[PDB]
Enzyme design. Structure first.
Site, short mmCIF file in Angstrom:
data_model
loop_
_atom_site.label_atom_id
_atom_site.label_comp_id
_atom_site.label_asym_id
_atom_site.label_seq_id
_atom_site.Cartn_x
_atom_site.Cartn_y
_atom_site.Cartn_z
N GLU A 20 -3.68 6.76 13.51
CA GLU A 20 -2.50 6.16 13.35
C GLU A 20 -2.07 5.36 14.36
O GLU A 20 -1.99 5.73 15.64
CB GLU A 20 -1.60 7.17 12.62
CG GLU A 20 -0.24 6.51 12.03
CD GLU A 20 -0.65 5.35 11.13
OE1 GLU A 20 -1.68 5.39 10.46
OE2 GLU A 20 0.23 4.43 11.26
N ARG A 21 -1.44 4.32 13.99
CA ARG A 21 -0.40 3.54 15.00
C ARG A 21 1.26 4.19 14.75
O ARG A 21 1.55 4.21 13.38
CB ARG A 21 -0.58 2.00 14.78
CG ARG A 21 -0.10 1.65 13.61
CD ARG A 21 -0.48 0.08 13.30
NE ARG A 21 -2.08 0.15 13.17
CZ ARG A 21 -2.84 -0.81 12.97
NH1 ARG A 21 -2.27 -2.20 12.83
NH2 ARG A 21 -3.98 -0.90 12.69
N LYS A 39 0.93 -1.22 0.11
CA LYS A 39 -0.10 0.03 0.04
C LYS A 39 0.72 1.41 0.13
O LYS A 39 0.61 2.36 -0.77
CB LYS A 39 -1.02 -0.03 1.11
CG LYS A 39 -1.41 -1.35 1.69
CD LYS A 39 -1.54 -1.47 2.98
CE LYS A 39 -2.98 -0.68 3.25
NZ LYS A 39 -3.73 -0.90 4.96
#
Ligand SMILES: Nc1ncnc2c1ncn2[C@@H]1O[C@H](COP(=O)(O)OP(=O)(O)OP(=O)(O)O)[C@@H](O)[C@H]1O
Ligand SMILES: [Mg+2]
Lengths: 464, 509, 74, 174, 52, 52, 463, 147
Positions: free
Chosen positions: A180-181, A154
């Site tokens: 987000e991580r 991705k």
């Protein structure tokens, strides 16, 4: 005199009182006096009482503490220097490399684009990836549905997209990390850096370690960034056309559900916020092209529970224009990217859009790929040589097609050598048409693999 | 004797040094460890509160006229009229390497009957994750002694990986055994137990003591007989102790128990606060609640280490790996809480009831269990040798249906089926029997070399054990070197294959 | 007891203290009280009709929804 | 809660009476009506369901005697309309709070084990003046069950010299 | 085993002090109760005022 | 060994109990140090607390 | 300073007090008119309290004075209760005259501390085939009985009762919790004709009383068991005692009933959020200790045979074995009628049971489950078309099923009430031989309704 | 519902005898009751059905399609039972019911293959035929009870 004092605190929601002669409007910005936390007007409770949300942690705070306003919604820095910079939702640097260079500030909110500014035309973005370029062409100012699990590149696809748009169309790139991580975010940063593309993109992340309001408003933040860049006109007018990358809009809807629940408002059919469609749209309408400049969107989409009839994906499809799906098997077959060239759907797939011949060509390719797919099982079970030789020809030709749709990437150059190849239409079209004519049925499948245009394919084939 | 008399007197003369002008409150309302109090206009959000009985409380709802706070100790001792008092401080618990070999309360109070604890340092339980700029990639592996786990699901120092499954599936055993394998890792470990039968807790304690590993280890448990708030906060405290060493540049491992259960407790607490309920009565922030916890564990950039130490340490980088556990209803993944959990971890592992019911010990379903961190969390040799298992297990699981079949099918299918059946059986394993990476290495080599593709399935485990002992005795320096480094070299593989073919030539299984 | 009426406003209370009747020109002009999401509770318009368009000093319009004993929702 | 409900009414009444300086009169009326509602008999007579707001209003005027006002009557009327008669004393209390803070006076409550002499009371008034308040309102209380000393409460603010010190030593020893 | 012995020793060593202190405070309570000095009342309130 | 040592240590806590009874009567004067010695003599008179 | 009736709605009661005088939680409140009693649930300020009525809900008048005891609920305990049946209040409901003792103890002690867990796991044997082979018990364990309506479950419990009584001076105790009083009376009389009541104590909650009473019967039984275990006899260690729960589900439902009226909001199923709190409170006071132990048997009901909701879910996190009864095995004429394939225990472990017994259990599991899955094809074609393999397997499985048929010691009339209580070792021997095939040459009938190999061989020879 | 059905049971002769104050001595008192529960789509998990089932002595169930299958009455023996058992039956009927129940269980066992009586065992066919006959034996008209 705008100093108001805290009156009540629960969890993340915050209540303040002010004078009944000077009351801030909704969505105004409140900075707590003596601390760096910020408050966001949600609904006027009368009596100078306002109920607001906080932006970050809420600790130690105590009632009666003075807070000022800004009499305006949130404004953040915008400008050319914003590239290669990671800021919060408040547009405040977190890269820890000095403050933001620009002094240009714009409020986050504005009304929907005028009906008058909707461009009276609809054309296609040029990309050099040779797959969407035929099967799912993008409109100019469209929404592209993207699906598939992680580990299929991705980030890589986004890399290539950015490279191409900035290179040919001089596009500028903005990316928003919703929910987000941190680790993958940092990896994406390092990738922005190694692949020399960081200098051209503006980065903002909202982590899943933050209260929801942060995550909700990073969206509008990046949106406004894009708006400023597009409306920033070029020489002779005609500001750039830009691409926007946003992760997991489903997370956005979830955070909206969060804040609606915290307001104490009843759920929706499944339990989303009843106002879901409102924010979805408010996000959408500011995504379009104009008589000056254009904006296009790439949005990571996740379908929880695989429900195509769930309200959130349903509302999503209300604005989706093209769908792109990523495969696991195709990548495992060493084909990159792993775009399934059979599920991707484009609203732009019409002879009135790509033209007559282009449309028919694409339809024929689809037919061939289908036909071979149902051929596969028989080839597996009942052998191969028990069929029509025309069907075998179909098999070979489809195999050539699949071998061909993958290509080297200019971003792949730094990865594994092998510099990528930019290819427009009118050669892909011609080469594919000739392949459909069967004039290349004298060549092994190898010449189509990891290669550019049909001229390159024939060059390799002769050299092979 | 008279010693204490002097001691008590000298201590006493140190007090009543002045009169306090403190601000406090009084009780208005009590129900189930929840108290509405009046007064205390000024109050830190989430201030820890003291009460006339010596107990303590946690303030959550700062409404415009009163305060709601939850009992931390044991209520059924408080009546309206008694006076509260804030501490002018936030919730804080002690940390320190002296906590090893010690079992404490979620507040950090000994329960091991080992007397007081000399923790030189205490810290606030609630903090924030460091700046994402202070994150550097994960490359050092974490060993589990589980060939399937260590092969298909690599685990790197500082990664968040989820064990999940249905009930009575050895999940507790999985965690504890992973803990055991840390004889040589040099890391420390913390176990967090939530809502458990003290019997089970003590059994785990005794077993660990038998292993003796309760020396680089610390554990806290919020058993089922504890105030809900204690349980709710406990994982945060465990995270605090972990972050201690992480910020010391050290690498460690921590394990939660039944994050679902503490979520339930938090649901109950919030509900008693008359907060607006969400779906399945769950206040929305449960997502925020868990997420603000998990992200606190990671592997940090050594630059962050250095700057925090202010020069004290400069070489290493801190890290902390997170191993939580979630129990599921009939193996659903669509439940709200697990759904929230999923998008948080860096990888997930499922447990399938049937396999353990089929006696597959362990009962992991590799078919869906993944680790998106790639081989970067394996050693070079395992990174090399995993692929054979990967592809063989694949092929098997697509076409395992032919078990009773293939009496007329093509031979290649039969051979591949036998290969698959054997390698599938290979992972059956017993608790408390961790495999050193050398053991796993010899097993995988024998696998891919097909030197087990000629022996009956029923004795594969016996074959493996015999091989294990044979090398362990004969070629101890080789495995010594291997697990010293974990590198794949032609000399190494040649020695291994020579030993294998000797073993086959030598004593039978 | 129950929640406050969203019409008991210290200004209004003090006004009725001054005098009860003749409120807001026999209720020809209304003053806004409660604001959320395009929904407005207003005090002081009895001359107003249910389902009537409502003019604003903002130059905008409002839709009459709830005619109540003390206030109006629009 | 109930105080929260009472808040706005207190604000309005205080603002108006201050603007008319009749604050004392309203305070006296508030004490009167608070005592009135305290009566079980008076309330039960008042809560009889056959009485429109006018009945209760005129009843309050009567029990007030020649002390009411048109603003008083309007206030009574409005409260009767929403039936908020019940929480009147809290309104009065907050009203007292407003007058105290407005006049910057602080009211201070002191309990002693032994009864006090005006000398010491004046000394303490001066002392709390050094605590930098405008003026003080001292209410003393004999509390011989307390071991000794004087305990002083100014809202949330408290200072101790009595048995509490001992409680502290015991907890310290343990 | 030896560590367990030590811990038990320490437990008794600390435990005794608690009942000792309880007896001491009960005696102190008795003495203060027999103390009837309002002179001390005046002295200590004056002392606080001085501290004030 | 634990039983023996604990029982004998227990047996050694009674003479210590009387000792610390005297010493806590002594510490009972530290209520005088609680004050500014507004009282410094009320305790020496009192020995009625001769308990255990 | 007496409170009065200020508001009553169904099961929730409220009282006014003088604000100085305020009752604490969990203390009894004396109706000044009737014997009925009230337990504090929460303090409502201003001298207002919320309570639940222990006893009848009749005769109640708004404004009736009520007094307290200022102390938790205490009932008499001791050997002066054995063979007597008490109410929730500990009063004689058997018309056998008043209780003899005054030893009264409260009912809301705390759970035993962590340091005082029995430092070692234990085991319990019953002399019963399927159980002692496939459902091992730890002394201090937690046992669940699921389903079973075509058989006498109470017969099974009474068999266990005779087991423990003859096995140990450790007495027994049962608590009626939503008791189907027909079965309760039957059990009472059958224990009576057994002449075994000296080791039994009886308290009943029988679906006719305010929910609090049926809630609190559990605490009563708990308290009796606790104290009775704590009676250290002549050695410093009292007997290990056994408990019988009429139904845990009704314990959950008792609190479930009035939770909402208490002002409690509903839970994920609409339940009480304090579900887990009370559950743990109940279980954690049931353990094995450094001195002595207490174990219990819980008659479990399952709603619609569904386990995937909280009400059994919470319970399961506290049991140690899931004995699930079998109906059609009873239709097969089997006396115990217990399923051999679904019931398990966490106690099946080689380290605790030894290796040989564990592996025998493994093998019997395998053979039975493999025989089950062949039933269909056997029906379709017949034994002949199967390979000669598994024919012996079918025979061995059938003989296993026969071997499980255990004549009951105490029914008084089912086969003559013969006890077996065969040693675990002898059964191990027999099943080892059967798995080996030592006797896979004899009709399964010879293994039916008998115990060890001696009985099987004698039966086979007599026929 | 509990306190309702709880009232229904059989009492000891002593209890009533003293209740009558000795007016009657010999007989004992008893009372049986039958409640009716209506199902939605035949669901059993419904709240009220759940409760009442948990209370009663046992279930008696009827299936729609069986009434539509001509089975009148349409009892479903697969799920309806009584904890009481033969104790409330006379000697002869208890003596007889056994093989009947067994045959019903057998027939219910082979339901899934009932539509394939061409390749099964002959003895299984005999069991099925017996089940069919006894099934038809369980038909009865209305208002027509049997001695
Ligand atoms: N590989 C193995 N070999 C032998 N026994 C095993 C193995 N793995 C697990 N067990 C046994 O299985 C038992 C049950 O596992 P465990 O209790 O850990 O499940 P759980 O999911 O933690 O239970 P709960 O859901 O109640 O927490 C353990 O007592 C352990 O002894
Ligand atoms: Mg567990």
């Amino acid at each position: 005199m705008s100093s108001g004092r805290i009156i009540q605190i629960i969890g993340a929601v915050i209540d303040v009182e002010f004078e009944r002669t000077s009351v801030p409007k909704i969505y105004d910005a409140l900075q707590v006096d003596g601390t760096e936390t910020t408050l966001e007007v949600q609904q006027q409770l009368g009596d100078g009482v306002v109920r607001t949300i906080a932006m970050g942690s809420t600790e130690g705070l105590k009632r009666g503490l003075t807070v000022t306003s800004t009499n305006a919604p949130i404004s953040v820095p915008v400008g050319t220097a914003t590239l290669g910079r990671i800021m919060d939702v408040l547009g405040r640097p977190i890269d820890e490399a000095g403050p933001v260079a620009t002094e240009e500030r714009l409020p986050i909110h504005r009304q929907a684009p005028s009906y008058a500014e909707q461009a009276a035309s609809t054309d296609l973005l040029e990309t050099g990836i040779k797959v969407i370029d035929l099967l799912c062409p993008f409109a100019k100012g469209g929404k592209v549905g993207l699906f598939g699990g992680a580990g299929v590149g991705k980030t890589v696809n986004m890399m290539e997209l950015i490279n191409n748009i900035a290179k040919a169309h001089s596009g500028l790139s903005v990316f928003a990390g919703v929910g987000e991580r941190t680790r993958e975010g940092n990896d994406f940063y390092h990738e922005m850096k190694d692949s020399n593309v960081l200098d051209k993109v503006a980065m903002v992340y909202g982590q899943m370690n933050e209260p929801p309001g942060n995550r909700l408003r990073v969206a509008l933040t990046g949106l406004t960034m894009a708006e400023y860049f597009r409306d920033e006109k070029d020489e002779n007018g005609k500001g750039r056309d830009v691409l926007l990358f946003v992760d997991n809009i489903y997370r956005y809807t979830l955070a909206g559900t969060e804040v609606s629940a915290l307001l104490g408002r009843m759920p929706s059919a499944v339990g989303y916020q009843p106002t879901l469609a409102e924010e979805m749209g408010v996000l959408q309408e500011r995504i379009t092209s104009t008589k000056s400049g254009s904006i296009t969107s790439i949005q990571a989409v996740y379908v929880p529970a695989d429900d195509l009839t769930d309200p959130s994906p349903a509302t999503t499809f209300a604005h989706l224009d093209a769908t792109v799906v990523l495969s696991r098997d195709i990548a495992s077959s060493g084909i990159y990217p792993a775009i399934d060239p059979l599920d991707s759907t484009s609203r732009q797939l019409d002879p009135l859009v790509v033209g007559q011949e282009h449309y028919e060509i694409a339809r024929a390719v689809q037919n061939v790929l289908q036909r071979y797919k149902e051929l596969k099982d028989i080839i597996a079970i009942l052998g191969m040589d028990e069929l029509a030789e025309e069907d075998k020809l179909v098999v070979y030709r489809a195999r050539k097609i699949q071998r061909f749709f993958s290509q080297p990437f200019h971003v792949a150059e730094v990865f594994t050598g092998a510099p990528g190849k930019l290819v427009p239409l009118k050669e892909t079209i011609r080469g594919f048409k000739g392949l459909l004519a069967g004039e290349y049925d004298h060549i092994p499948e190898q010449a189509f693999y990891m290669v550019g245009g049909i001229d390159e394919v024939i060059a390799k084939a002769e050299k092979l | 004797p008279s010693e204490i008399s002097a001691l008590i007197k000298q201590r006493i003369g140190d007090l009543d040094t002045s009169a306090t002008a403190k601000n406090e409150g009084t009780i208005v309302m009590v129900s189930d460890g929840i108290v509405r109090i009046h007064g205390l206009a000024d109050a830190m959000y989430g201030e820890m509160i003291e009460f006339d009985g010596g107990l303590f409380g946690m303030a959550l709802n700062l409404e415009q006229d009163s305060v709601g706070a939850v009992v931390l100790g044991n209520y059924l001792s408080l009546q309206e009229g008694q006076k509260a008092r804030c501490t002018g401080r936030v919730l804080e618990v002690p940390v320190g390497p002296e906590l090893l070999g010690r079992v404490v309360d979620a507040l950090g109070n000994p329960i091991d009957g080992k007397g007081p604890i000399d923790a030189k340092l205490t810290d606030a339980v609630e903090k924030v994750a460091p700046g994402v700029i202070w994150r550097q990639s994960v490359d050092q592996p974490v060993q589990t002694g589980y060939k399937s786990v260590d092969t298909m699901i690599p685990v790197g120092r500082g990664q968040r990986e989820l064990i999940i499954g249905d009930r009575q599936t050895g999940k507790t055993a999985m965690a504890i055994d992973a803990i055991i394998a840390q004889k040589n890792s040099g890391i420390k470990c913390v176990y967090v137990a939530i809502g458990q039968k003290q019997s089970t807790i003590a059994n785990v304690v005794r077993k660990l003591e038998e292993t003796g590993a309760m020396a680089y280890t610390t554990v806290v448990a919020a058993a089922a007989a504890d105030p809900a708030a204690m349980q709710y906060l406990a994982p945060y405290s465990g995270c605090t102790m972990g972050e201690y060493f992480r910020d010391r540049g050290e690498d460690a491992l921590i394990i939660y128990d039944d994050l679902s259960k503490q979520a339930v407790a938090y649901r109950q607490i919030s509900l008693l606060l008359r907060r607006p309920p969400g779906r399945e009565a769950y206040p929305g922030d449960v997502f925020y609640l868990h997420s603000r916890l998990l992200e606190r564990a990671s592997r940090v950039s050594a630059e962050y280490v250095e700057k925090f130490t202010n020069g004290a340490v400069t070489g290493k980088t801190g890290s902390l790996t997170a191993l939580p556990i979630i129990e599921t209803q009939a193996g659903d993944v669509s439940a709200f809480v697990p759904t929230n959990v999923i998008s948080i971890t860096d990888g997930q592992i499922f447990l399938e009831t049937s396999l353990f019911n089929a006696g597959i010990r362990p009962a992991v379903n590799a078919g869906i269990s993944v680790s998106r961190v790639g081989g970067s969390a394996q050693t070079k040799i395992i990174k090399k040798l995993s692929g054979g298992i990967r592809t063989a297990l694949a092929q098997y699981r697509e076409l395992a249906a032919f078990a009773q079949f293939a009496s007329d099918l093509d031979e290649a299918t039969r051979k591949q089926l036998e290969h698959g059946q054997r390698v599938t059986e290979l992972m059956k394993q017993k608790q408390y029997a961790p495999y050193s990476i050398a053991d796993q290495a010899v097993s995988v080599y024998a696998s891919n070399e097909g030197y087990m593709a000629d022996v009956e399935v029923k004795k594969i485990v016996d074959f493996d054990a015999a091989l294990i002992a044979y090398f362990r005795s004969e070629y101890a320096p080789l495995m010594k070197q291997i697990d010293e480094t974990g590198d794949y070299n032609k000399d190494i593989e040649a020695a291994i294959k020579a030993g294998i073919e000797s073993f086959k030539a030598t004593q039978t299984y | 007891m129950q929640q406050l009426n969203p019409s008991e406003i210290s200004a209004l209370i003090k006004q009725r203290i001054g005098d009860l009747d003749t409120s807001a020109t026999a209720k020809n002009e209304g003053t806004i009280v409660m604001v959320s999401d395009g929904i407005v509770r207003i005090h002081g318009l009895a001359d107003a009709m249910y389902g009537e368009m409502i003019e604003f000093d903002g130059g905008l319009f409002g839709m009459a929804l709830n005619l109540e004993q003390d206030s109006v929702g629009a | 809660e109930l105080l929260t409900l009472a808040r706005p009414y207190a604000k309005a009444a205080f603002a108006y009476a201050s603007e008319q300086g009749a604050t004392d009169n309203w305070s006296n009326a508030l004490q009167v009506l608070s005592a009135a509602v305290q009566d079980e008999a008076f309330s039960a007579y008042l809560n009889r369901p056959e009485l429109t707001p006018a009945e209760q209003v005129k009843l309050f005027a009567k029990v007030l005697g020649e002390d009411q006002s048109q603003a008083v009557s309007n206030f009574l009327t409005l409260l009767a309309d929403n039936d908020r008669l019940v929480l009147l004393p809290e309104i009065a209390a907050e009203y007292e709070q407003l007058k105290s803070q407005n006049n910057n006076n602080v009211d201070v409550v002191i309990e002693s084990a032994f009864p006090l002499t005006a000398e010491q009371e004046q000394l303490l008034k001066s002392a709390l003046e050094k605590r930098f308040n405008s003026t003080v309102t001292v209410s003393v209380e004999v509390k011989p069950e307390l071991i000794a000393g004087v305990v002083i409460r100014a809202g949330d603010q408290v200072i101790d010299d009595s048995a509490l010190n001992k409680l502290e030593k015991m907890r310290t020893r343990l | 085993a030896k560590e367990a012995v030590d811990q038990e020793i320490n437990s008794a060593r600390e435990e005794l002090r608690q009942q000792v202190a309880a007896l001491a405070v009960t005696g102190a309570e008795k003495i203060l109760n027999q103390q009837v000095d309002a002179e001390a009342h005046n002295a200590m309130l004056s002392q606080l005022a001085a501290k004030l």
